[PDB]
Amino acid sequence: XXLLXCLXCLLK
Amino acid sequence: XXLLXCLXCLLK
Amino acid sequence: XXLLXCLXCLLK
Amino acid sequence: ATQGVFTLPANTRFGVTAFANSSGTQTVNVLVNNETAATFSGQSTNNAVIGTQVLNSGSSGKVQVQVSVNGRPSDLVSAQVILTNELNFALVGSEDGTDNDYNDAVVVINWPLG
Amino acid sequence: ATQGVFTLPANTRFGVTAFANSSGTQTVNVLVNNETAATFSGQSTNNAVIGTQVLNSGSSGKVQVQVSVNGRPSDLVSAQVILTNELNFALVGSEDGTDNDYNDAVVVINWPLG
Amino acid sequence: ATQGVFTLPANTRFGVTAFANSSGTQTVNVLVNNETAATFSGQSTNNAVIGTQVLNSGSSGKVQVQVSVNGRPSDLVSAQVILTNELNFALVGSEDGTDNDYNDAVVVINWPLG
Amino acid sequence: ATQGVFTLPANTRFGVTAFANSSGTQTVNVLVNNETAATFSGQSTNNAVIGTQVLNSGSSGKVQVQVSVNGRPSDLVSAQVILTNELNFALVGSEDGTDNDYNDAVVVINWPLG
Ligand SMILES: [Ca+2]
Ligand SMILES: [Ca+2]
Ligand SMILES: [Ca+2]
Ligand SMILES: [Ca+2]
Ligand SMILES: [Ca+2]
Ligand SMILES: [Ca+2]
Ligand SMILES: [Ca+2]
Ligand SMILES: [Ca+2]
């Protein structure tokens, strides 16, 4: 869901 | 079933 | 909306 | 349970708007403190606005919506919903027949205004 | 969270009605399947109806309400309420300023009709 | 009007939880497709959870909540609320006596889960 | 708009119950008059009750729900619904991640009790 959205998802 | 009867039926 | 118009808008 | 009765804050302006969706003419009475404050009447099967008005909830804040069709009280459903702890909707549907769509008169009360 | 977006049953007629309570002119856009279906414009501090229309939810059923004042999007609050498993209200409040009354444009969507 | 009946999306997992606020023992039946899927029984005047369960709405999505005390059905009030077009609450209150607090069994259905 | 904040009648007992639907551990703080009155911490992906408690709304009736996961505040959605002008539900959903199911902690407040 966008760059931040992705980063959020990968970090989880 | 009449004029009002028809309008009634048609609207419902 | 002019001078006074803008002042009102900014203050509001 | 009783339906169509709402406690508003006292002395508050509120909007009331009624829509019709029925072959029968809808009679919507709005009571404030048990006295008729507004009456809407109209017939539509296409959600026409049969009335909209601003009223005041008065000293008691008690607001009641009554719906009748050709002199017969309709069955009411209602609820109050509050958004962001501030915006109030009091909602009413009514059924004048047997199909139970509950849209025959639809009444929306909203406050605050202004 | 996203606000002002509602999934209606597909291919269903619904009413959309907007009220204004603000010194600002309210522009209310209603999108169906992401396409503009109705636009209302008006100003009132007395809950005037600035628009009312019957629309079709179309093949997707997706209905979105947008509100802006002088080109700036208002902050929206919304919810859907269903009474007696039949009567549906999709409700939107909006805030164009800083007093947080969220009534500046109020949008009520109701279905089914007829 | 009928209360305590909700159409969920089909084949959807949902939570159902009952609280009690009465001297009478509450019996809460949860039906899916007109067949009992869960039954809770308990007594509390302190809002105790008398049951919580996860069920599936099945092919029909029809969920019905019934409440009775000593064989006597309670008067039900209900509504469904949807937040951000996603999070659903189906809510039931019930009155088993004379005081009309409508909290004697309170039932909350929520979905989606997970 | 602000979410998770509700004004209750003063000096009123209310129930607060939290359910979890997330891989993340949910910390739910319930503040009364700006100070924590209950804290729940739990984890479930299947709607387990992670806390339930009876609280008193105190002097001003201000109740606020906060949800955090790993110290980060979740995005909240909320509304209040009133049935038969008497039975109140204050509803909160929360999102801790990216899928926007808004069920990661679900909080239901109900009053009156007893
Ligand atoms: Ca009807
Ligand atoms: Ca009808
Ligand atoms: Ca405003
Ligand atoms: Ca305003
Ligand atoms: Ca009772
Ligand atoms: Ca009770
Ligand atoms: Ca989530
Ligand atoms: Ca989740």
Author numbering:
A (entry chain H), B (entry chain F), C (entry chain E): 103 to 114
D (entry chain B), E (entry chain A), F (entry chain C), G (entry chain D): 1 to 114
Original paper wording:
Herein we report the first X-ray crystal structures of mixed chirality α-helices in short peptides comprising only natural residues as the example of a stapled bicyclic and a linear membrane disruptive amphiphilic antimicrobial peptide (AMP) containing seven l- and four d-residues, as complexes of fucosylated analogs with the bacterial lectin LecB. The mixed chirality α-helices are superimposable onto the homochiral α-helices and form under similar conditions as shown by CD spectra and MD simulations but non-hemolytic and resistant to proteolysis.
For the mixed chirality AMBP bp69, we obtained two crystal structures of lectin LecB complexed with bp71, an analog of the mixed chirality AMBP bp69 with an additional side-chain fucosylated lysine at the C-terminus. Remarkably, the ten crystallographically non-equivalent stapled bicyclic α-helices observed in the X-ray structures of the homochiral rac-bp65 and bp70, and the mixed chirality bp71·LecB complex were essentially superimposable, with RMSD < 0.6 Å for the peptide backbones. In the case of bp65, bp71 and Fln65 the peptides were aggregated in bundles of four of more helices via hydrophobic contacts between leucine side chains. A closer analysis of the different X-ray structures showed that the peptides did not make any significant contact with LecB apart from the anchoring fucose residue. By investigating the structure of AMPBs we discovered the mixed chirality sequence bp69 containing seven l- and four d-residues folding into an amphiphilic α-helix within a stapled bicyclic peptide similar to the parent all l-AMBP bp65.
